[PDB]
Design a protein around this nucleic acid. Structure first.
Ligand SMILES: Nc1nc2c(ncn2[C@@H]2O[C@H](COP(=O)(O)OP(=O)(O)OP(=O)(O)O)[C@@H](O)[C@H]2O)c(=O)[nH]1
Ligand SMILES: Nc1nc2c(ncn2[C@@H]2O[C@H](COP(=O)(O)OP(=O)(O)OP(=O)(O)O)[C@@H](O)[C@H]2O)c(=O)[nH]1
Ligand SMILES: [Mg+2]
Ligand SMILES: [Mg+2]
Ligand SMILES: [Mg+2]
Ligand SMILES: [Mg+2]
Ligand SMILES: [Mg+2]
Ligand SMILES: [Mg+2]
Ligand SMILES: [Mg+2]
Ligand SMILES: [Mg+2]
Ligand SMILES: [Mg+2]
Ligand SMILES: [Mg+2]
Ligand SMILES: [Mg+2]
Ligand SMILES: [Mg+2]
Ligand SMILES: [Mg+2]
Ligand SMILES: [Mg+2]
Ligand SMILES: [Mg+2]
Ligand SMILES: [Mg+2]
Ligand SMILES: [Mg+2]
Ligand SMILES: [Mg+2]
Ligand SMILES: [Mg+2]
Ligand SMILES: [Mg+2]
Ligand SMILES: [Mg+2]
Lengths: 120, 401, 109, 205
RNA sequence: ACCUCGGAGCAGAACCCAACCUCCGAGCAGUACAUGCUAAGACUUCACCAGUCAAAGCGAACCUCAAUUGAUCCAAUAACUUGACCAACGGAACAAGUUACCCUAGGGAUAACAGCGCAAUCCUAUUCUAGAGUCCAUAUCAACAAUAGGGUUUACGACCUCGAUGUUGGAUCAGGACAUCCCGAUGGUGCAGCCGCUAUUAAAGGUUCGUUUGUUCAACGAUUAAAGUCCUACGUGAUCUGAGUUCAGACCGGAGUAAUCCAGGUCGGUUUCUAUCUACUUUAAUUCCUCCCUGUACGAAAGGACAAGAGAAAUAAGG
RNA sequence: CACUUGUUCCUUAAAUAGGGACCUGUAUGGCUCCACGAGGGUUCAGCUG
RNA sequence: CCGAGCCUGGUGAUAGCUGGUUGUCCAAGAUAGAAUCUUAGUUCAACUUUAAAUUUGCCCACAGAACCCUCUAAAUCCCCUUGUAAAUUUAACUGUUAGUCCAAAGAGGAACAGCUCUUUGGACACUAGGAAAAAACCUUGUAGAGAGAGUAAAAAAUUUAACACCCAUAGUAGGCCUAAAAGCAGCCACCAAUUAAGAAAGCGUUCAAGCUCAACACAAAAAUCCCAAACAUAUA
């Protein structure tokens, strides 16, 4: 019978080689995930459909910010084959009230708080 | 597989023969014997009602009886049906039992084909019972399809199977002729060893040839394949003994005649050797049975006339008494076989003077059996006493004038 | 040749898993054999069903098994047990939540 | 008794209850009779299948005839046929109950030893007819000595260690990457893609 | 054969799971007479009906078993209570056969023919090297088995068609495959020659007439160079035939009380269609035999050739 | 007495067709074809697309 | 137009059976079983729709759910947090309850079927792209116009068998065995000479003899007619 898959915990224990490859320090982990649905929930189990709806990833290629916490991570583990997860980067820090209207999420995963649309 | 059988022998030795037949099955055990006399062998019930009721009550009272072996050549369909209904167990006759042992022992494709031909009558007899589970009540109301009914279709299929078997057996006969071509061309004398079942044909051939691969079994109908083994006679002549299938009495002729494809090697034999089991109480009946079986097989009349006889199993107790296992009269038997092959194959034992040069002596060695060579060095020649066939003599006369 | 075997499932098993608030009289688990044994504040019916004798929380534990001395089969099993061996069984417990009652001032005589 | 023992067609006490065809007994790697015992050569099953009394007779006759009894000995590493296989009458429509017991087989799983030979001989003397038997077996089989079996196991381990493919069936199946467990079987999590039905892919890493 | 109820696998771990699936069982028995009355809260066979457990309380002492059964109405009884192997077991209060004399509504939800899936069965080829073949696996075969291929048999499935896909054979015309029966070329041979056997290649051409039987088949007669295996809607009924099968009539044998039926035998028994569309409608031959070689080669004899040449015919095509 | 189990004879070159015998078992309503028949089979000779 | 006439009437007989069931537009909408003279139907359940009341609904952390059985699957139930916004209840209803393939666990069959039967899930009974055409495989879904753009899945790979050359005297025909059995029918031992040779590993001999060897020396085929055309070398 086809059932829900229990991912062994060893899969989610990064190695030093993984750290070097993907550029992430085990200490000081990132706070937020940018998650984009890159796969259709069609032809996938209803539980994956429901998890996608819960995470609010109904539209494909639409980034969504999520907490990097154990429960959200469990849901993302359930639907990990349909999504792309990246760490949200804040080169200029968190947006403030003043610059809340000038933000932009660049394809690199950086939320720039000044968007001038002018040459550097 | 496993069968406990009650041996019901009608009467008008044979019990011992039927017991041996049962034992041959390797899983069939005789658990009861009933010799019952009757004056009407041909009837729906072979026995008069007085004996029939006693047999029925005895059989049904005995619970170990899985089947009954009626020592009759072949029981008709009504007789089988009535006996089955009365005795509440399966009924087997000589035909069925012999057919079963033939099927069990048959190992070669030729033997399997021949026993299938032998079975064909059994399949025809049991057609109704073998197809009763396929009727499904379909016929005469379904308005389309071939006009053949269920039984007509089954009979057609059985006939087609029999035709296939007969075609295959004809091909086998052709192939056997092809195989015999070479031995016939090189003029090997052929002696076909025939006789009653279990009379010692295989053992005698083993004793004569000296082969060790020959395995004379204790069970009946051990040899189901016609096979040729070479041996040497006192005259240094090589003779080919053909071991054949044994014959049984009170058995349908068709069963054995189904083996004619492989038994035709007997017809092309130069001599026939009847192995009489003299120790057996019914040796005379065995002789009658085997002679009738050979006549049915249509062996050449000259060959049947020239048939030699050897009394095997003489140790247990005009001809040559022999003991195959002990090996008592083998040398004598070989002497008479030598004489018989000389007078049958048209081989002349003659002295022949040859110049000791030109390879005439080597030619004579290779194309004839040089019994002896007396050499005259003064004339530089040799007189060879040799057993030479007519063809070899003609070849020599032309080659070396 | 094979007749019968058409009986449906008894729908037996645990009705209240651990941590479930249970009111007095609730059936905790229905069983054909003694899978879970009665614990504190848990009663057994004629058909071996476990019902809550008090209002509280269901807890499943593993506790040593000491049959009644008149339970001949269990006593024989124990008599045949090697020294040092202790049987264990799963027991169902109801940890009562509310107190039996409170003392209230009813009249200031 | 150096020569190989005779094997009966069916158990002496015949089974009465028809039992389901649990093909799992053929499927997957073999966990029994996987190591040599009192012998140096054997026939290894590189696949799953059922051995009939016909196969047993073939093995017995060939090995007995081709061996040297005074310098070689052979022993079965597979039990006599015990699993009953039932066949209905020819021409029978579907239904009407399970068929009557027809034959007995012995399940064999890939990686198991079928016959084991030993004695004062080397591999080359026996590999010939062991390979004949293996080729005539119902499943893929190979005549293997202790040394050759260890060599092939070490070769498999070496291939697993030095494979340059970043992606392995084991990794992908265990992590459920791409959601491939929707297409795989629960058995695949332990077969690691090296087994497919009764077939054992040996080159598969 | 089964129809209701329970236990165990399938269904390994909360629950639940089909099967004309594998196995076991039940239609009670026994002990007590508080086997009394009441009452929170729960379970529940996937509905309902029904079935389960039960604290506390009154009253008393100081129920075993898995199933072990059945509603309403209606009867008997003063009442309490009792009543169906209603087992087709959610139970019509009480009703069987046969229909080819049949009819109607439908069904390709479902059979017969056909197609199609499958290849158990069937056929074929290789592999092993046991065994036949005097010796010799491999001239020819070939057991136990293994691996492949085909879709001609017997089957199974029920996917199209029951507001019709007309049915077995035969006539007529034939199209195609080659796994070749003959004619052609070649290798081997247990090929001395003639007959042969086997294998590779070859589908241009050909592959008979009759007695019996509806015979497709089969037996037989006479031939042939051969009288090939198949597929084509078991090719071909808007081209034909209807002898069988397979309507309504009637007998004989069997079954039944009978109607009537039967995988028994038989005598008789309506064969429609004027063509709208597609398609199509004038495209260097084979073989046998006689003679000669030659009674030669070959062969101990018996028997008996190739190749080359000559002559005769037959069929087919075209005139 | 009738019908059934097998063997055989005539008829044809050839017959699962037609006719005639003998041989095994079943079963006061069974045998007997004189004449007749668009009845069902077999056949000599002739005839003829 | 007689298995029982015809006409009229009851009569618009009845039909769980077939067929038909007529404006526009939007929205929700495929889902366990039980009983049934019942499996071509219906009632209840489940699902579905609408409106209303209320508050928890789904996902799910530990902890927890059996021995029989020695071991043993994917998993399941329960479940705070968390991500989400749905859930239960009330009122009123219909319709679906003759289903297909795919992956997986199995059963029956023959470890056949486009076969049949359960379970988990998917898809189809809805749009679109792809796998050639294509219900069930892969991608992808919420809908309009555009003569813009980035992508998803998405194109099969393979070509396979040569091989040693030279040389051989001999204790003896090792014993027993057997008529003989001589390296070679079988059993025992299997030593030993020549620099170099097994009391012999296969042929062959009735038996011998003659041959070697070891030893020195230096993949496939079926029926109307194969089936895009082609292409090895211009920088992912
Ligand atoms: N006492 C004794 N028995 C003998 C003799 N000859 C043969 N036998 C036995 O008779 C039986 C015959 O066996 P085979 O010789 O194989 O039989 P066959 O003659 O081939 O006959 P089938 O078994 O029918 O093929 C065996 O038990 C032999 O041992 C003899 O001279 N004396
Ligand atoms: N509960 C119950 N009712 C019955 C029983 N026997 C008969 N009845 C009632 O009577 C009906 C059956 O009628 P019948 O079959 O004629 O009964 P009977 O007793 O055999 O014969 P009569 O007395 O002639 O009616 C049922 O449907 C009930 O109404 C029974 O055993 N139990
Ligand atoms: Mg014999
Ligand atoms: Mg059950
Ligand atoms: Mg309920
Ligand atoms: Mg009912
Ligand atoms: Mg009639
Ligand atoms: Mg009608
Ligand atoms: Mg059909
Ligand atoms: Mg259909
Ligand atoms: Mg179906
Ligand atoms: Mg139409
Ligand atoms: Mg060809
Ligand atoms: Mg007609
Ligand atoms: Mg007429
Ligand atoms: Mg007629
Ligand atoms: Mg017409
Ligand atoms: Mg005629
Ligand atoms: Mg009228
Ligand atoms: Mg109406
Ligand atoms: Mg909508
Ligand atoms: Mg969109
Ligand atoms: Mg050498």
């Amino acid at each position: 019978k086809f059932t829900r898959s229990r991912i062994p915990e060893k899969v989610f224990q990064a190695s030093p080689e993984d750290h070097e490859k993907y550029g992430g320090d085990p200490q000081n982990p990132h706070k937020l995930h940018i998650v984009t649905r890159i796969k259709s929930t069609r032809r996938r189990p209803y539980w994956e459909k429901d998890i996608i709806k819960m995470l609010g990833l109904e539209k494909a290629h639409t980034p969504q910010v999520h907490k990097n916490i154990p429960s959200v991570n469990a849901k993302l583990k359930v639907v990990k084959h349909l999504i792309r997860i990246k760490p949200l980067k804040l080169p200029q820090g968190l947006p403030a009230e003043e610059n809340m209207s000038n933000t932009c999420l660049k394809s690199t995963g950086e939320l720039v708080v000044q968007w001038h649309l002018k040459p550097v | 597989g496993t069968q406990r059988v009650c041996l019901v022998h009608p009467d008008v030795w044979q019990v011992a023969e039927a017991t041996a037949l049962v034992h041959t099955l390797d899983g069939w055990s005789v658990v009861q014997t009933m010799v019952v006399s009757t004056k009407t062998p041909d009837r729906k019930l072979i026995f008069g009602k007085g004996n029939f009721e006693h047999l029925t009550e005895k059989i049904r009272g005995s619970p170990d009886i899985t089947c009954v072996f009626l020592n009759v050549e072949r029981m008709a369909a009504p007789t089988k049906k009535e006996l089955e209904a009365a005795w509440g167990v399966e009924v087997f006759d000589r035909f069925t039992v012999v057919l079963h042992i033939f099927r069990c022992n048959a190992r070669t494709k030729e033997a399997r084909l021949q026993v299938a031909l032998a079975e064909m009558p059994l399949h025809r007899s049991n057609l109704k019972r073998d197809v009763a589970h396929l009727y499904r009540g379909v016929g005469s109301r379904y308005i389309m399809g071939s006009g053949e009914s269920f039984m007509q279709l089954q009979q057609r299929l059985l006939r087609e199977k029999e035709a296939k078997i007969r075609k295959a057996l004809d091909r086998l006969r052709k192939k056997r002729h092809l195989l015999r071509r070479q031995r016939t061309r090189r003029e090997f004398p052929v002696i076909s060893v025939v006789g009653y079942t279990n009379c010692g044909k295989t053992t005698l051939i083993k004793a004569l040839t000296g082969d060790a691969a020959i395995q004379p079994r204790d069970q009946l109908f051990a040899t189901l394949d016609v096979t040729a083994h070479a041996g040497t006679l006192p005259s240094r002549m090589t003779v080919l003994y053909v071991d054949t299938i044994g014959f049984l009495s009170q058995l349908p002729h068709g069963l054995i005649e189904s083996f004619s494809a492989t038994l035709e090697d007997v017809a092309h034999s130069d001599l026939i050797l009847h192995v009489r089991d003299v120790s057996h109480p019914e040796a005379e009946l065995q002789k009658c049975s085997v002679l009738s079986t050979l006549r049915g097989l249509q062996l050449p009349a000259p060959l049947l006339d020239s048939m030699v006889e050897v009394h095997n199993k003489v140790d247990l107790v005009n001809v040559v008494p022999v003991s195959a296992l002990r090996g008592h009269g083998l040398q004598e038997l070989k002497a008479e076989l030598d004489a018989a092959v000389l007078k049958a194959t048209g081989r002349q034992i003659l002295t022949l003077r040859v110049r000791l040069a030109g390879a005439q002596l080597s030619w004579l060695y290779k194309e004839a059996t040089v019994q002896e060579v007396d050499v005259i060095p003064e004339d530089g020649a040799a007189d060879v006493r040799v057993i030479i066939s007519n063809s070899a003599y003609g070849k020599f006369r032309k080659l070396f004038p | 040749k094979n007749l019968g075997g058409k009986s449906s499932g008894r729908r037996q098993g645990i009705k209240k898993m651990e941590g479930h608030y249970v009111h007095a009289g609730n059936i905790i688990a229905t069983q054909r054999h003694f899978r879970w044994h009665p614990g504190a504040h848990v009663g057994v019916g004629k058909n071996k069903c476990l019902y809550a004798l008090e209002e509280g929380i269901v807890r499943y534990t593993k506790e040593v098994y000491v049959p009644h001395p008149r339970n001949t089969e269990a006593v024989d099993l124990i008599t045949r047990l090697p020294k040092g061996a202790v049987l264990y069984k799963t027991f169902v417990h109801v940890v009562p939540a509310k107190p039996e009652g409170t003392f209230k001032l009813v009249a200031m005589l | 008794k150096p020569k190989l023992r005779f094997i009966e067609r069916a158990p002496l006490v015949p089974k009465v209850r028809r039992e389901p065809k649990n093909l799992s007994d053929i499927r997957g790697p073999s966990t029994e009779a996987t190591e040599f015992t009192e012998g140096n050569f054997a026939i290894l099953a590189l696949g799953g299948g059922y051995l009939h009394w016909g196969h047993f007779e073939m093995m017995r006759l060939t090995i007995n005839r081709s061996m040297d009894p005074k310098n070689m000995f052979a022993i079965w590493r597979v039990p006599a046929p015990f699993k009953p296989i039932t066949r209905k009458s020819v021409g029978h429509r579907m239904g009407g109950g399970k068929g009557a017991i027809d034959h007995y087989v012995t399940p064999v799983k890939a990686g198991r030893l079928v016959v084991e030979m030993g004695g004062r001989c080397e591999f080359e003397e026996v590999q010939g007819f062991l390979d004949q038997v293996a080729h005539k077996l119902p499943f893929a089989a190979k005549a293997v000595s202790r040394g050759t079996l260890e060599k092939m196991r070490k070769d498999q381990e070496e291939r697993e260690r030095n494979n340059q493919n970043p992606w392995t069936f084991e990794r992908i199946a265990t992590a459920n990457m791409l959601g491939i467990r929707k297409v795989l079987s629960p058995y695949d999590l332990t077969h690691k893609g090296k087994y497919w039905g009764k077939f054992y892919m040996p080159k598969r890493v």
